[PDB]
Amino acid sequence: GYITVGNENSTPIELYYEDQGSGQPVVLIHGYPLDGHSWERQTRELLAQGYRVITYDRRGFGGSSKVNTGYDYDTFAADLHTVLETLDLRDVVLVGFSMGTGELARYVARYGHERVAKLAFLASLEPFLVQRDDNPEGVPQEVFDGIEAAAKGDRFAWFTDFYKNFYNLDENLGSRISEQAVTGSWNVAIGSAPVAAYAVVPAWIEDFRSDVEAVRAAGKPTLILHGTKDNILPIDATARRFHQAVPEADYVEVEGAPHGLLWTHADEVNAALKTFLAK
């Protein structure tokens, strides 16, 4: 399916989406640089549990418009807003992974939470990833400058390097992810808009601290889940701070899990989501 969310010059900006099953709606918002099918090990379990599972592809990724403009969380949240309004979803469970955790918080901040039943943040960006004078816990800017330069420099070679760290392949290749599944991740990645490989870097490092205040003040059931061996989003720079800021959230650390834990630790992710959604 497609939902129109805007225009880029003479072209409509269309987000590809899938809408499956019946029951309470659950919207899964994928990470960089994948698409809605990256949720497959979660989707099939949620469908079996009697939820209506919707995924969509972020602008620039998967089946969505390969735009040049709007790679920022105000825009990504406006896109999500349009998806929820177009489908008129109520009592929705929002689930974000990696980049998708940004949509959840920015959406609540900008649009409120009348439509939202629950929020699940998996491998979160929050609260503020890049080190600044007022954010000493963050990661030095130079890391992101280097990533931006690599992704712009040759996105094809970059995605290979990125997935090594995404999945902790030295540890997990052949035990928790096959060579073929890694190749599938790469094939999806290179289909994204060339500019999207690096245009998202500034979005990743936006300050979400005020959005985290909105999320906490909403008082809706919230889950924060992270792998302890996440080498993309270091657990001390993200989830542990997010947990400190939102102590009411259910909190899960998946021992030994990498960033790419929807696949490598699908069982643990599924168990946490099953418990959380049953509340």
- Interface of this chain with a copy of itself, residues 58 to 97, rule: CB under 8 A: 66-69, 87
Residues 257, 68: Cα–Cα separation, whole Å: 34
DSSP H/E element including 142: helix 141-153
Binder among 15, 34, 52, 103 for a copy of itself (CB under 8 A): 52
Residue from 98, 124, 185, 192 carrying the catalytic annotation? 98
Binder among 8, 72, 137, 268 for a copy of itself (CB under 8 A): 8
Residue from 35, 230, 243, 265 carrying the catalytic annotation? 230
- Interface of this chain with a copy of itself, residues 164 to 223, rule: CB under 8 A: 178-181, 183-184, 187, 190, 193-195
How many positions of this chain bind a copy of itself (CB under 8 A)?
A: 40
Binder among 74, 85, 145, 154 for a copy of itself (CB under 8 A): 154
Q: Contact letters (x/-) for a copy of itself, 109-128, by CB under 8 A?
A: --------------------
Phi and psi based region of residue 76 (left: phi greater than 0; alpha: psi -120 to 50; beta: remaining): alpha
Residues 58, 121: Cα–Cα separation, whole Å: 17
Nearest to 121 by CA among 12, 242, 266, 258: 242
Alpha-carbon 94 to chain mean position: 11
Are residues 225 and 122 in contact, defined by beta-carbon separation less than 8 angstroms? yes
**What minimum distance in Å lies between the beta carbon of 198 and a copy of itself?**
9
10 in active site: no
- Interface of this chain with a copy of itself, residues 213 to 272, rule: CB under 8 A: none
Binding to a copy of itself by residue 157, rule CB under 8 A?
yes
Instruction: Output the six-digit token pair for 82.
Output: 């349009």
SS3 content of the chain, % helix, strand, coil (to 5): 45, 20, 35
Are residues 171 and 179 in contact, defined by beta-carbon separation less than 8 angstroms? no
Residue 50 is classified by DSSP as T
230 in active site: yes
Binding to a copy of itself by residue 150, rule CB under 8 A?
no
Binding to a copy of itself by residue 141, rule CB under 8 A?
no
* DSSP string for 33-71: T--GGGGHHHHHHHHHTTEEEEEEPPTTSTTS---SS--
259 in active site: yes
Residues 264, 41: Cα–Cα separation, whole Å: 10
Query: Which residue, 10 or 278, is less far from a copy of itself as judged by CB?
Result: 10
Active site residues: 98, 230, 259
Contact positions vs a copy of itself (CB under 8 A): 1, 8-12, 17-22, 37, 40, 43-44, 47, 52, 66-69, 87, 152, 154, 156-157, 159-160, 178-181, 183-184, 187, 190, 193-195
